[PDB]
């Protein structure tokens, strides 16, 4: 996972996109490639478009998805 | 039976006041309690039925009766008049004692018991519950046991309505919800 002493990890470039989205209270899906950023309750409610290697699949963030990484809901491989 | 002597003094009038009934013959009462055991896998071994009858005898305190197949069904590999279950019916003192024992001692011994469904009445005040393991009754001992069996406990009451049946059951202290 990570170390609690280090603190939550969120990419600065996406954190800026949510500080320019929760003040505005827009519903525009923020298009992002950083799957390595953990969903915090700060942007709970809005929509992101996470790159899964091929496309920017939409992930509407919910209340019980905080603490997870953005990539957990953007599978990259297709079984069948 | 202490539960009969308690229902004849407190529970009857409490049920009347609760349901708002204008006649003492309207308040529900339990008429009988029937314990059943489908041993459909019998008539191939006929020792499972022996153990089921012994378990019913010890649980109820009353010699049960072997129930035969009313029809012939190939899917269950049963032919007419084949012993495929066990049943006992308790009335009056025996049923009041059994239900007191079941509510006090045995019903907390059900593994992972949160409650009993309140929508399990058939729609005429009678209740039915399933016991998945017959070891919750202290009468049967864990040392000597054939296997783990189950049992139906059907509580047939004089209530004509769903709500009256559950009010009567809850007046006894039945664990609901």
């Amino acid at each position: 996972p990570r170390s609690l002493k280090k603190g939550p990890f969120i990419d600065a470039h996406l954190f800026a996109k949510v500080e320019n989205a929760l003040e505005t209270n827009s519903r525009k899906p923020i298009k992002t490639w950083s799957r390595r950023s953990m969903i915090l309750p700060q942007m709970v409610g809005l929509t992101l478009s996470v790159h899964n290697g091929r496309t920017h699949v939409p992930v509407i963030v919910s209340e019980q998805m905080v603490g997870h990484k953005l990539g957990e809901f953007a599978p990259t491989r297709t079984y069948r | 039976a202490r539960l009969k002597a308690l229902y004849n003094n407190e529970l009857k009038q409490k049920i009347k006041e609760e349901l708002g009934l204008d006649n003492v013959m309207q308040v529900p009462k339990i008429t009988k309690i029937t314990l059943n055991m489908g041993v459909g896998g019998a008539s191939q071994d006929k020792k499972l039925l022996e153990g089921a009858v012994a378990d019913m005898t010890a649980i109820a305190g009353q010699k049960p009766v072997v129930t035969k197949a009313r029809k012939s069904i190939a899917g269950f590999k049963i032919r007419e008049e084949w012993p495929i279950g066990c049943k006992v019916t308790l009335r009056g003192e025996q049923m009041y004692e059994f239900l007191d024992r079941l509510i006090a001692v045995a019903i907390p011994r059900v593994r992972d018991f949160r409650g009993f469904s309140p929508k399990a009445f058939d729609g005429r005040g009678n209740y039915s519950l399933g016991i998945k393991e017959q070891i919750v009754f202290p009468e049967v001992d864990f040392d000597k046991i054939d296997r783990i069996r189950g049992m139906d406990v059907t509580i047939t009451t004089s209530a004509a309505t769903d709500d009256e049946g559950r009010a009567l059951l809850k007046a006894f202290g039945f664990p609901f919800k």
Binding site: L4, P41 | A60, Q62, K63, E97, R101, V105, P138, E139
Partner: protein, 61 residues
């Protein structure tokens, strides 16, 4: 009740020792010991449980 076809049915003193509550009730059980209630000495049966004893994260870290 037909005669001598039913099992022995005698009063038993069940006792929830956690809350220390007694339940006097006829039963088919044959207890090893016998403890006296306010009346006679009934076959005593201890009980582990009875009807008297049975019953964001991101911000924190």
């Amino acid at each position: 009740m037909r005669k001598d076809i039913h099992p022995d049915y005698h009063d038993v003193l069940f006792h929830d020792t956690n809350a220390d509550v007694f339940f006097l009730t006829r039963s088919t059980v044959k207890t090893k010991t016998t403890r006296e209630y306010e009346g006679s000495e009934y076959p005593y049966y201890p009980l582990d449980i009875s009807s008297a004893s049975h019953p964001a994260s991101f911000n924190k870290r």
